[model samples]
Target: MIMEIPAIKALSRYAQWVIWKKERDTKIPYNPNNGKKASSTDPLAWGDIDEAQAGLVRYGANGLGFVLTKSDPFVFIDLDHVLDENKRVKCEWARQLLKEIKSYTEISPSGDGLHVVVSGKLPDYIKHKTKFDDGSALEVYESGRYMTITGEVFDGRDDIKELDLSILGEFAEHKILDDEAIIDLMKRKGQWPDAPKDGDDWSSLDMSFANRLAFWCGKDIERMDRIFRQSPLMRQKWDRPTAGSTYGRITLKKACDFVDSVYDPALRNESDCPFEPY
Candidate 1:
């Protein structure tokens, strides 16, 4: 039996539309007029639903595409790998978020994830991706990206709820546990040396703390050194170069490997996710 997909009437009112197709490893957006590769940063490449659907009709009906922009009130959110094989929301936190959002939602093409389109604005500083401790991921986009259009609405609902997304702003504050969490593991626990003097060699305790820090920061290496330096455990020796990278980077790299080994809660098969081929 073919599933019925009701078109989103509210989305049709928007002009920021594009046509996307799966090309090898990546699903790319193309200009409706010229069928050229569309740039997420460029609005000139996008058009209204008419042109975009026509583009799809002329070229290929890979899927419908919609671009999120700052000028508009569309907030796109993707809850990754949160649905079970039966197409029920499996991740409790993701399900709670959907309840709070109460907006136009759909299952991602792969059927294991979800797509939510809301009317809201988040602060520019708010980060896009949120990976739960259990590995279920949530990605919110207000601008500079395109969202896959799967008109198969979730729960047979189609209301674009207006949200302030202040919860996300607060989430951005503590999204990545950096210096504080690592500091507690070192200073409070006293398992790792907080202020190791100069000329001291790396110990098992230091490496253990680094592993904890990596896990605390959600395995994100961006400004990891900065986060590490923020801790009282850091000393002058951390800056000195070892073989190629600095001692700090070397230990951080080691810690990341530990996190990768230990912290894998969600097993999402990315190859099957048609909505997010990029």
Candidate 2:
């Protein structure tokens, strides 16, 4: 028998209402730096967030997405269920997930986890469609804040953990924003030329974290070509892997695969030539 694929029933409910519930029950906000502490000691996702909210925010139906400006601009991987008891499977699953998600989003593996770079932030508007990958989207709400992607909320569920793709990882220093601060920052940054403008509607945004990530992966290929040229076979064959992986150990094939994953032959993919990483 074929297994049933999960679907997102309400993007708006997951992104807004569900996350709100996580926040309300936790009593403490979700903080990446402190999520672990909260999970261990505080009554957040485990005790407070209800089944409906948890389904939407924690291990919900839709694939989660986020647009982060503080750290390196890249998509984050939400390893909803990492079953590596021996820990040897880290690189194996990371590599495989990168390839699988590449078909749907920009993918890069964090040393300990993975990263899937996308084009932009979560759209201001949500949808009730099955557009996201199966078992992907999860609500992240705590305190008064909510995000459609991963970072801070720490629930002790066996299936969840934040993959630190930010340049600073968990240590990256940034100005934590209050609601007003977040809004003010967005206003000052101005909408990305391709970002949606008419209202808080995200559907019209030119690209999302999924789209941008593909672009970045393609760009990396170009960079790899330049490196290969400067060093020749020695560089392409050996030096590149040993030397270039510091940024993130993505292979040329992996990079190309990401580009292909995000490609929409029907429409022109967005350009990174003018865009800056978020």
Candidate 3:
């Protein structure tokens, strides 16, 4: 199969790539160099596309893997056990899920699954895995591990597209928290101690709290501001841009910082955290 250089470069821009060996009997992740087990958390496991390609060439690896990191905006979905004896996707749930995610997709080496590429981060507070009635599983993750990239395109789509957060609702179980609920949760959980006191004033609002809240809610700048502005805790003036700024850079920075912190394996799951959204 021909490797897509542009696709590799685009993915490598935000994530690290690695060489992977597939299991002969199971077609699961394996190590080509040695018969020993391999994992995404291996310190030396991750590399650039060139290194990955070199490994594929040098060792005849089954494929390459994309290491997910919080610093980047990428989410990978693995639909497991969805193919039939004919090597066709037989699970309706998997097919519908794939349709909803209009991003780069590749058939797994086993010809029994798919790997989907999209843009976005999973909420740090939530785990992201789901199971279907047909014994199929859906795994969504943003960081702390790697995903196998078969370099095999599906349905003629080869480009990775922006992630749609709404897709999370289909695979993961999540609850929408309104302003009141958020404020109550914070107070009860001792998350943001200065919330009530800083009501309606952007100056006193904790930037870190704002950031964490935005990420937890899975919202971008526009959606974040819109949601926060309507909340009783925020003042109407807080959403207004200042000076020559088109967007709130300060808020964006904090949100990104929060994502990085949560995505850090040292702080959370050091190994692969399966996609179970709760």
TM-score for each of the candidates: 0.61, 0.18, 0.53
When sorted by lDDT, best at the front, the candidate numbers are: 1, 3, 2
Most accurate candidate by lDDT = 1
Candidate 3 local accuracy as lDDT?
0.61
Each candidate's lDDT (Cα)? Answer: 0.69, 0.30, 0.61
**Position 30, candidate 3: lDDT:** 40
Clashing pairs in 3: 127-276, 127-277, 128-275, 128-276, 128-277, 129-275, 129-276, 129-277
Per-residue accuracy of model 2 over 146-248 as CA lDDT, tens digit each: 2243322122111222343222222112222332342233234442233234564442132232233334333445444333222212112223345546222
Q: What is the lDDT of residue 229 in candidate 2?
A: 27
After superposition on all C-alphas, the RMSD of every candidate to the true structure, in Å, is 14.9, 18.6, 16.6
Put down candidate 3 lDDT per residue, 1-278, tens digits, no spaces: 44443456588664266666655343334443443445656645455666667666777777777778777788888888898877678988777877787888878877788888887766654436655544677777887767877777777768878765675676665534354454444444454433354335545454545565554444455555544543434543453676655235466555655563232313543222222211
TM-score of 2: 0.18
Model 2 CA deviation exceeding 4 Å by range: 1-17, 20-47, 51-93, 96-191, 195-278
Which clashing pairs does model 1 show? none
